[PDB]
């Protein structure tokens, strides 16, 4: 597919590895990995007090027989107004991983999908002399993005992270850090040639 | 109530029936009141028979 520069001009074409960017996407696998990665983000810091954990409750409120009232064991029994919760949330992890091979297939398939749909833009360089958000915004217009976009870069390029930091739909990541959920969260995928090399090197 | 030389004293454990019912009991040390001088001056102190065995003041 085509290879274009920051300015937006064509710079020849580049050949993506068909074992990474060519394979027939496995949608079922991508969905499974997305659900797992969403589940793994959960903090799961939720808790309620059961009848043991609620303050007080110790004594039998009134004698078992004779008073004409329903028999009760504690003022913190669950049917009592301020009483214990019966089950309800307990702190737990929601994290789980599918097997490594399925996780590799998922990233291969989501990246292949982006090529098929023509959402993947392969940039020769992408760098900035100084951190300047105006310049990065202008760059996006030259590439004709005008959506959410994941930017993937290799060379340290500290100025690229800073320049895109304040833009709302835009996420800049290393290339080592490319994940199924990050690619799925963004419409366009802008990648530098140097980053493509690093992604193919892993997959 | 403790050996001044060693530290021998009461320790707990079980009494066991045939049928192996357990109940708590103690083992007291064989402490004897005797005059010795740990400090320069003599004094009546608990000492275990075991501690007296061999070399002691009396």
């Amino acid at each position: 597919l085509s290879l274009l520069k920051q300015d937006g001009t064509n710079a020849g074409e580049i050949t993506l590895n068909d074992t990474v960017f060519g394979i027939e996407p496995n949608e079922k696998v991508v969905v499974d990995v997305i659900l797992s990665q969403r589940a793994s983000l959960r903090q799961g810091t939720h808790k309620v007090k059961n009848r043991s954990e609620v303050r007080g409750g110790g004594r039998k409120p009134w004698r078992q027989k004779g008073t004409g009232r329903a028999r009760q064991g504690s003022i913190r029994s669950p049917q009592w107004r301020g009483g214990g919760v019966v089950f309800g949330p307990t702190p737990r992890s929601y994290a789980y991983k599918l097997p490594k091979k399925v996780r590799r297939l998922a990233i291969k398939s989501i990246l292949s999908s982006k090529v098929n749909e023509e959402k993947l833009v392969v940039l020769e360089g992408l760098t900035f002399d100084a951190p300047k958000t105006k310049e990065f915004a202008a760059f996006l217009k030259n590439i004709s993005v005008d959506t959410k976009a994941l930017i993937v870069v290799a060379g340290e390029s500290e100025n690229v992270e800073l320049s895109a930091r304040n833009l709302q739909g835009i996420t800049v990541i290393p290339a080592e850090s490319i994940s199924v959920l990050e690619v799925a969260k963004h419409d366009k995928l802008i990648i530098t040639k140097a980053a493509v090399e690093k992604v193919e090197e892993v997959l | 109530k403790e050996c001044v030389i060693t530290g021998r004293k009461s320790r707990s454990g079980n009494k066991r029936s045939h049928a192996m019912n357990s109940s708590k009991r103690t083992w007291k040390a064989n402490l004897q009141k005797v005059r010795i001088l740990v400090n320069g001056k003599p004094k009546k102190v608990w000492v275990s028979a075991r501690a007296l065995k061999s070399g002691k003041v009396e």
Binding site: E27, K28, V31, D32, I34, L35, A184, K185 | -
Partner: protein, 144 residues
């Protein structure tokens, strides 16, 4: 991300008892009426037979465990065909190839299947049939 469709039949809705009679699991919530099995935490322990002497106590204990029990990793002839002709096949080669991962007490060659290639196969043990079959092809079995 707004069009996610998990594989058809991979996920099912859990059954919720005690949520009304329309569902078919209302009121008694699938437990039927009364008795030990209708109660919270109810039910007898696993093998319990309501006081009839359980099966395991009707029948005697048998045997002992050998402290020095050896268990050999088994390699049937068929997998030796994988190797090239006139090859020396050692334990270290069998684990490098990944034919046996853990070498419990040693590697023993068994006859199941047949062998085509000429191989010099060293293992800790061979079945009588193994030795014959390796030699019948034209091999030399060594016992390390």
């Amino acid at each position: 991300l707004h069009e996610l469709k998990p594989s058809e039949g991979s996920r099912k809705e859990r059954n919720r008892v005690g949520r009304g009679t329309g569902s078919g699991n209302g009121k008694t919530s699938g437990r039927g009426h009364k008795g030990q099995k209708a109660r919270s935490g109810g039910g007898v322990r696993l093998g319990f037979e309501g006081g009839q002497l359980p099966l395991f106590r009707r029948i005697p204990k048998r045997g002992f465990t050998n402290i020095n029990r050896k268990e050999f990793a088994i390699v049937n002839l068929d997998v030796l065909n994988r190797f090239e002709d006139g090859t020396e096949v050692t334990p270290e080669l069998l684990v490098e190839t990944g034919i046996i991962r853990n070498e419990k007490s040693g590697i023993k060659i068994l006859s199941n299947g047949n062998i085509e290639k000429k191989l010099t196969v060293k293992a800790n043990k061979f079945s009588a049939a193994a030795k014959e079959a390796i030699e019948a092809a034209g091999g030399k079995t060594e016992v390390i």
